[PDB]
């Protein structure tokens, strides 16, 4: 039986007014219900999107179980977190709109139910949940393992995702060591190679006479701090003014931390939260939340953001946010996507200890023009095609992307090949490390093996240039695009990736 393409929402909206926890989900969805129809329809136009088996697909969304204790439903409205509940929205949106059979559970009794009755060929789930899983599936929960895919937003690196490994390295997290393909780990930014990027739509409702006249619509001197609890705006003040002397300071918060010069409106509703973006010239980072995605939204809507530059790097060694957290990874500055992937105009990072460094973004930000920007892969159709590619083409259970897309490079001592590939602008592909831990695939690249060893190390497959000495992998579960060598070089995978959809490879469609 194969999927069709779904045009209408009702049997969408009828599925989520079954738990009282899906109503901020389906809201947004509402909103947004023009352009992913939009967006389904020109993508089936572009790309054939026939012959696609029809799948059974259990969601199964752990934070919202009582059994949990995350209280995200209940401050859903409230000025919580609701990074998650907007992925999780745009993930069901789009399976449904590719016409899959969605199964949706925020409980014991519905987890029990579905599985408990068979069929299942995909599952998406949190962490959170899928401790449930093992737990009430009992040992055959491993039967399942290859058509997981796990929503976690930070990402997990292989060395917290092998239980053996991460003990030998005395790790504590108690998120990491599942021993899954770490590819099945589905990020909410492209910041982890060794895992997939899922990411969500950016909302936005600027049409084109919004986009001619946007300069009558936004307020030139009109700023809004991002930051919609108290605790965020500790000891931000000197900053604050320092924006303050050019611009009015907003602010959305549901207060002993905001000065009396900052107007609050509290926290809005989507569509009013939408329309203050629109008439905002400058959406201001704190420093916290990290890797959210309001920041977007505000890029989307003409805004440039003010992005907090961490110098060091924010990671477990200095924060405590951070760990206990599956990975390594640190970050540059409050939204390393929005630092990287989009820069200036439309994002400024700055020292916000550097006075004049603040100052002068400030007053040119002011005398920019506005320059509404998305990019394609938060759009629905850049969504929709990602996941749809994901969908047809990952299969962990049994060749993609394929061999043609490998650009072997070799990092530097002190260099990942996270690093090394996106220097040549390219992306690190764990799924071609097993083309090249043997001798005879080295001599193909151009590096010949004089004597070689196994170790199981993240930090292998490596090579001494001066000794003419080659290490292999000896454990095919710790592959990693993470971890630099101190003093040898990495021999690493690359691949090329599609302007502005950075998960898929040219050939990978
Ligand atoms: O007054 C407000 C402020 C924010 N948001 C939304 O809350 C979401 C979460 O954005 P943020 O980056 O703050 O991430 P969080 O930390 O809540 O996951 C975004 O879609 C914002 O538009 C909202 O609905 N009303
Ligand atoms: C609301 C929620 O569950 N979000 C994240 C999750 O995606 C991530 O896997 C985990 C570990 O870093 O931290 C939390
Ligand atoms: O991870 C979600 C949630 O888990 C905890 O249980 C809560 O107390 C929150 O502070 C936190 O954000
Ligand atoms: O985002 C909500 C909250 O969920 C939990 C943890 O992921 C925290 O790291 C995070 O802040």
């Known amino acids: 039986s194969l999927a069709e393409i779904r045009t209408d929402f009702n049997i969408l909206y009828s599925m989520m007014k079954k738990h ?45 179980t009582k059994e949990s204790g995350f209280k995200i439903a209940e401050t859903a409205f409230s000025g919580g977190p609701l990074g998650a509940l907007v992925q999780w929205s745009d993930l069901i949106t789009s399976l449904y709109l590719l016409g899959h059979d969605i199964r949706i559970s925020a409980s014991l009794a519905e987890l029990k139910e579905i599985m408990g009755g068979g069929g299942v060929e995909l599952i998406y789930i949190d962490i959170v949940g899928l401790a449930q899983f093992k737990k009430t599936l009992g040992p055959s929960w491993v039967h399942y393992q290859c058509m997981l895919r796990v929503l976690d937003s930070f990402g997990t690196e292989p060395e917290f995702n092998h239980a053996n490994y991460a ?93 009396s010069y900052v107007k609050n409106h509290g926290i809005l509703s989507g569509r009013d939260l939408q329309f203050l973006l629109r008439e905002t010239k400058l959406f201001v980072g704190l420093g916290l939340p990290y890797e959210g995605p309001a920041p977007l939204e505000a890029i989307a809507n003409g805004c440039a953001f003010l992005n907090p530059k961490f110098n060091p790097p924010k990671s477990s060694k200095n924060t405590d946010f951070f760990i ?6 640190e970050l540059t500055s409050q939204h390393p996507y929005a630092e990287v992937f989009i820069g200036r105009p439309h994002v400024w990072t700055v020292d916000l200890n550097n006075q004049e460094e603040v100052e002068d973004a ?36 049994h060749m993609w992307p394929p061999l043609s897309a490998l650009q072997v490079k070799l990092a530097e001592p002190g260099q990942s090949c996270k690093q090394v590939c996106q220097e040549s602008q390219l992306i690190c592909e764990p799924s071609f490390f097993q083309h090249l831990n043997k001798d005879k695939d080295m001599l193909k690249y151009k590096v010949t093996c004089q004597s070689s060893e196994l170790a199981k190390d993240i930090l292998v497959p490596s090579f001494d240039p001066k000794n003419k000495h080659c290490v292999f992998q000896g454990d095919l579960l710790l592959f990693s695009c993470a971890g630099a060598h101190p003093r040898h070089q990495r021999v690493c995978p690359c691949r090329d990736f599609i302007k502005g959809q950075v998960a898929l490879c040219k050939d990978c469609l």
């Open 324 to 329: 206990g957290k599956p990975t390594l990874r």
């Open 20 to 64: 009282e926890e899906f109503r901020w989900m389906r809201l947004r969805i509402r909103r947004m219900a023009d352009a992913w129809i939009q967006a389904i329809k020109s993508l089936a136009e572009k790309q054939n999107l026939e012959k696609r088996k029809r799948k059974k697909v259990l969601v199964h969304l752990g934070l919202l």
């Open 362 to 397: 400030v007053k040119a930000i002011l005398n920019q023009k506005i320059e509404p920007y998305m990019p394609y892969e938060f759009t629905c159709e850049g969504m929709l095609q990602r996941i749809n590619a994901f969908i047809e083409k990952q299969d962990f259970c």
């Open 167 to 259: 003990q030998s390295k005395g790790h504590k997290t108690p998120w990491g060591k599942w021993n899954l393909n770490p590819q099945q780990f589905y990020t909410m930014f492209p910041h982890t190679p060794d895992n997939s990027f899922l990411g969500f739509v950016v909302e936005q409702h600027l049409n084109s006479s919004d986009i001619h006249h946007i300069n009558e619509i936004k307020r030139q001197n009109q700023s809004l701090v991002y930051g919609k609890v108290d605790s965020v705006w500790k000891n931000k003040k000197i900053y604050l003014d320092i924006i303050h002397t050019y611009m009015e300071v907003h602010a959305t918060v549901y207060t002993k931390n905001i000065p």
